[model samples]
Target chain A: SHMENGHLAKVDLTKKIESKSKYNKKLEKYQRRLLALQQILKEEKIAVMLVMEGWDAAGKGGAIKRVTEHLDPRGFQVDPIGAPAPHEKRYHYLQRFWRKIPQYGQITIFDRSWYGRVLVERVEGFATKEEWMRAYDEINDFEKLLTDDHYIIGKFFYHISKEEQLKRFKDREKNPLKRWKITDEDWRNREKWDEYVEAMEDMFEKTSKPNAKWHIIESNDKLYARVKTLKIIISFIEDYFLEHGIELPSY
Target chain B: SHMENGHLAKVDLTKKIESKSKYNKKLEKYQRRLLALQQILKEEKIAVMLVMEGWDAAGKGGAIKRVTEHLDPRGFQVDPIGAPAPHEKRYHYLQRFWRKIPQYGQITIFDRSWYGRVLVERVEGFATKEEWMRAYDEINDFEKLLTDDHYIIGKFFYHISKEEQLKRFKDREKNPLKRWKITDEDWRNREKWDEYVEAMEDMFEKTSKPNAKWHIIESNDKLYARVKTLKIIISFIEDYFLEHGIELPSY
Candidate 1:
């Protein structure tokens, strides 16, 4: 049976922009708005954490660069997450992530983040059934703690069709500059596409709560995904300010 | 040249209790009070972080044990900090400590904590002069963030005279059960007592801010030190609750 009714399967990956000029305009607009927001956030001492999770070549790195493009270097940091190093594996799985959270008045972007507990770790059998099963509540609790501390959280999951991913994978192999980005592991992971979809759907169903919701970005079009994610983040900050009755300075 | 007027030199370490019955009664009284406060803290979702730092063989372990002797195990954790593991060394020095912070409705005790940036790391040359010197502000900022998040922080520095430290060291070496606790490193550290004293005085002067003031425990008498530290902690919680107009239930 097709996963036609699942969350991931329902994503419309064909979303795109026909006009390059419009795409560029929207990107710059959101980027500048985010930069202005960063200034207010710093002044107000509100911390923000952006979590990026997606398929291997779903343009997370590029999207992150765009998000921070016009922002001050001192106020933001991007943390890249990988498999737990031997020493990191020794502590509670959340320990390493807790260490990377943004302090007040700053922004931290995770290239890939703690969702690995329920996604990669679960799918690849790296975490036991019980561990992965309980992680949903643990993660919800972690996010709730941050939200209660007045942290602004944005979680984005980039989605792309299997055909689009394979096409990008092949294009990477032919291009020397991007060859390193495409690896045999990507192809191997592609074979389990159905499994990842199920895991992702489960994640979206379980972890999408009020304080921190998952935003599924249809990523067949890179420009659209980037602009959309930036807009979502800007809205998150603005909505928080509005709800808290804090007036925002117009940029 | 005798160092006689520094903060460490001025401590009245001779403070002690003569009656075992009084010590026992006072200890139980405070312990029962602390347990009640912890229950209130949990219900209010106010987190607590206790930092314990002292001279080598100054009874830090025993003080910590007594602090948590009757605490609900599920609600509190004792983090025994030491040399950073290789992976931990790769991040900002505060990263590891940040990871150990208590979430809402819990307590976390650090046997030795971030003060090492100015103490052991400074005296031992593990961190450079610029790094350790700048760490004073960094630490202040770190504590300010936690306090802003409504975390109740208690920092204790157990002070013992040089002669008393030697006595405890020799006693540890003679007791088969405690011999393992005293290592060659303790003797080596004893040789740098003056350097540590200077570092500690600097730390006290720079870091004892209004929100999280430092409490110096006259630790030559373990029973007195334990009871005093417990009283300080209970007072810190009671003060915070009182300031916030939150009434505590009498035990």
Candidate 2:
């Protein structure tokens, strides 16, 4: 663990996790708490938006699926954001997302979100230097509006070592259903790993704020990452409710 | 057959379609043309957005899946528009949809789109009379801007009788994977079917413009409806390509 601007930085990519039995025990409790929070979330009309970003095959999809499995489908939406649509390309960078923000008491999970501007786009030259450079402030201002509206926003970055990613990619290629997960783009992207690291470092430094916390998932282990994904979100909502003096209904 | 505003209404929902063998033969050709056109769509940076509005279980999802099955995922997106988010409720009614508009050389298929303002929102009292009353014009203007940008837009209304819808709903109920498709809101909405019909009629009369065309899909048979949906979209793109004199690569 390292320190960054008073907030601790979690940069351990090879970190291991708990035993399966212990994880399951902790997960059952966290899952129950999350369900309890959802009940209150809807009751109190609080909105939560979870943003996840990471390397492809870093288990973002698996993490999201597990985290949201027990939540009520009616109040939660999983938006798998890929490249920008034609219309999204023309409008303000943030406009596409504004259309999908969680209503009060709902959760909107973004597999890959607007942070693309500062990461993939920045590293791949998909965005001009001027564009990515300005996105940090734009994003900060954007989050400010949501927070001002009493929306709870949590951002997560999944980190994994390059060797771990390659092993996972090779494993995915052998499974027919999982084979679709690996594409030529994934391999091409690996070549630019260093560029991506620089961009992500700059992004973390610029966008991480006090009120809106950024939790980095040490995704070298899928189980640990998945648990952290759910646990961190539950923690964020718990803190928000406690701070606002909103009492959660206990199980 | 009934006639309205010089447009010959497709009133025979029970009309027989070609045999499944014949339909398969024809669909192969249309699907190929669609794939061929997608290449030119990207090369010329043309955007296409298909708006699908139909009764529940009217095969909107099935038709969309078939229409887009052969298209490149990179150049196409199928967005299933649902109930508005809390943030959507607070913003301009059109703001939510503004986010998913197709990019250049891309195809965006909307399962249920902005027409909800005039259809479900109007019939369900989610939107006030005045709000939906003004939506016809707001929608027209929105399409005008998109069309002005040289975007090829087609709106399809899947028309199925009440009896047919009930049959599909019951079938969905028995299928485990499909049971979730039917909801309490769906059952409740059917109670106001007459109101929805009136709203749809008014929407058709008001929003069907000269520049942008609205194709009505007679969807009594799922197979027939899916094929016709693909044919109509391919026809639209063909006309657009012809007008622009862009030669599509031969399949």
Candidate 3:
């Protein structure tokens, strides 16, 4: 009774889902369908792009696996960025990232990208206010070009409660194979949870736009997040083809 | 034997490996690394779009699974397309697709995407020659925007032979799980094999530019094809991050 009566009033009714198994099945179906979308994109000549971000313990990795689980290798790619390389320091912040664009028929996935301008870079004070502040336009202009050239964009952010993250952190440290997952950084990040939450809320306000809107997935539950991500991404791909006016490949 | 002699011909053949994986151990290593890449891509704020196409019996599905096998269910997505749907018929060729781009950070893998304008659509006369003729420029512009924005795009074609395709087709028809793989339409399309080849040749010739180069993988050998495919996409991701720059999240 307490489970239902306590802390239930503020719950998000719209995203409230039941039957994790059902959602998992649906997610598999969607992943397979995404493969079809990939094929169609090739034939249609449209590009697809996706963005992802979330808290340290959020299930972003699991969500990504569900997203890519069924796609063919040739047409899709995933990019995970780390500290700046020596050469990258010479160019303007985003200039170094110019070469990863999808061609007439392709998709690119960025694990972490230039968005650091506002997220980590902004919160970490790695960039001055002016530099990170103006990245919106610069980012927008870049996306505009992809769209102008025929790229279909989709974006997502994984969200999790602090309590959920603590559970995950505990799981990571206790499980044998996963014990290696915990690190000093994660503990440090845990200490600054509120700071990250503030940064995330700010990121949502400034970055989510009409052309490249944001999708937030409450990932307190891994299965829930995985299924939601798969379904949403497929819906977008299916919709992308539909929106682009590409009739079924034809009989 | 000629096989052993031929394989032994080159002393430093390891130099040819773009992915740095040349043997069984290396294969596992690359697979693990690729899985890690998927993990990273899911967490960061960025999108990836991919396109895969080639001979009728090319191992596209196997290649796709190999790429995604180790990824967590939550982090990635894949879509495989078929004939267009009713809702997809009304938009401009690119309109339906425009909406699929990944958001602030996400990845969308299209088994086959929009290039059908020049491939099947053109060869089958579904698209007028004039429509596809202008598609080259249209596509180039489309990709420019995505790259400009900061998404990574990777594209590949797996090439097989007519005899090999026929063999696989026969095999698929006999296998229950794969019995649905081939159909009358597939055989009918095979009738225009030469035409498809010519179109592909032209597509490759006219479109291969510095920004968007084609990766032609030999599909006669599944292992070779799989390895090359993974490495190629990885290279694109690595290259892009190197260009733009990256920093490890603070520890």
Candidate 4:
């Protein structure tokens, strides 16, 4: 099972952090560093894919928007994959996603990504057990290849408690604009929660690697989730730039 | 020559109406309809390509963030092209970009898009005149093919003034968070302002289409830019769904 928590190193966001008003210094620093990272990645022809997979109601868009807010959209992209095409249907399911990698100085963020093979396709019977069973190895190797090609791949499965999800679902239902958020399909999928978790657990045990380890974020609170995502994305970028001695291109 | 605007469009963001505000009864009633548009785009499986282009120091990032803020991440993507990649260089300049069209129910946004062939690439000696001149047909054909494939396309050219650009460049230097926004190359590029404007004029004259026309946005004010971007995205999405009969998959 995705172990109620997926063996992720749980981060207690409330441990001790300055207020947003107090955190302006770090905020400014990361903004430039993020830009620098984009420039360097572009110059070096590095491709990065940041994959975000989470429950339907678990604030993925908000977290992604916050993370991307600082990035130069002129140098990066976000590709939100929903379903495959007839052409995509013709290939090894993963083939549909392979072509969207960044060229240079570009980063691609997937709001929810290819892990659908194990989580959705497996449960929905869209993919046979044999096909999905082999996907772990396929995904691991493909990601490893991207890493070798100088891509910094970040994967996250944003997690929320069942109680938390129910709360969000209900909240969406009551709000007129947000009501469209809760669908009969989401409710139907909720029934398969246990099955999705098991498949996810299988995926992690088989595919987790140091280079592209999955980051499981506890997303009970939106602020906590946004800040946590930005910090990880920014710090990793800063570290990469320091090691690479790469400077940003003039924008 | 690109007509130099005396100033950017004056906007009243302070008194702007919130589409989702509690008092907005029509918006409240239509919130589900709007969100269902997202679900509809997914179910209809039409690929959407949105091209966003503008000048140095224009508010493309801020506008793009707002436009994508409410979207399903898995249903769309943003691509900011970098200097040519080897593979892209080996093919037609547009080939690599041609490879990124979304599958069904997906969208792709391009910031500083392919018009570069006739704009920057043409002005900067990166492309042969013949290559760039011919690219007009190539681009139109490419877009026409996508439309034939049932893609919903939107093109935007964010407009700003020379004064606004200078002011923004100075502001970026002063604000720590924005200090890294401008670069030496940006100044160099701006120094050739006349040449760039001519190229932009040529581009507009040659590539602007009636069906796939650019929605020129006045973007001197960031808040105005955000609201304008949101309005256009929502309006186009709403119309696209209605015309296509794309409905939320009975979720």
lDDT of 2 at B36: 73
* Interface Cα root-mean-square deviation for all models: 10.0, 8.4, 7.8, 4.0
User: Sort by TM-score, best first: what order?
Assistant: 4, 1, 2, 3
Over B62-92, each residue of candidate 4 has an lDDT whose tens digit, in order, gives 6666556455555667777657877677886
lDDT of each: 0.87, 0.82, 0.70, 0.71
Candidate 1 is graded, for docking, as incorrect
Model 1 native-contact share? 0.21
The per-residue C-alpha lDDT of model 1 at residue A188 equals: 82
Regions of candidate 2 where Cα sits further than 4 Å from its true position: A1-45, A57-151, A159-189, A194-251, B1-39, B57-149, B161-164, B167-185, B194-231
Over A1-251, each residue of candidate 2 has an lDDT whose tens digit, in order, gives 12243222347665767588888877677776787788789989889988999888888887887887566667788888887979788998788999989989899999999999998888888889899999999999988889988799999888888888999999988843345568999999999987777778777889888767788888889888988888888878888889899996672
Clashing pairs in 1: none
Model 4 Cα displacement at B69 (Å)?
Answer: 2.5
Q: How does the DockQ of candidate 3 come out?
A: 0.04
**What is the per-residue lDDT of model 1 for residues B1-251, given as tens digits with 9 covering 90 to 100?**
33577777888878999899999999999999999988888888688989999998898899999989998999899999999897665445666787888877789999999999899899889988977887787788667656755688889999998899999999999999999989998999999988888888889899999988999999999999999999999998999999898898782
For every prediction, compared with the true complex, DockQ reads: 0.10, 0.04, 0.04, 0.32
RMSD of each: 14.9, 8.5, 13.2, 6.3
Which candidate's DockQ is highest?
Answer: 4
Worst 10 residues of 1 chain A by lDDT: A86-95
* Residue-level lDDT for B142 in candidate 3: 81
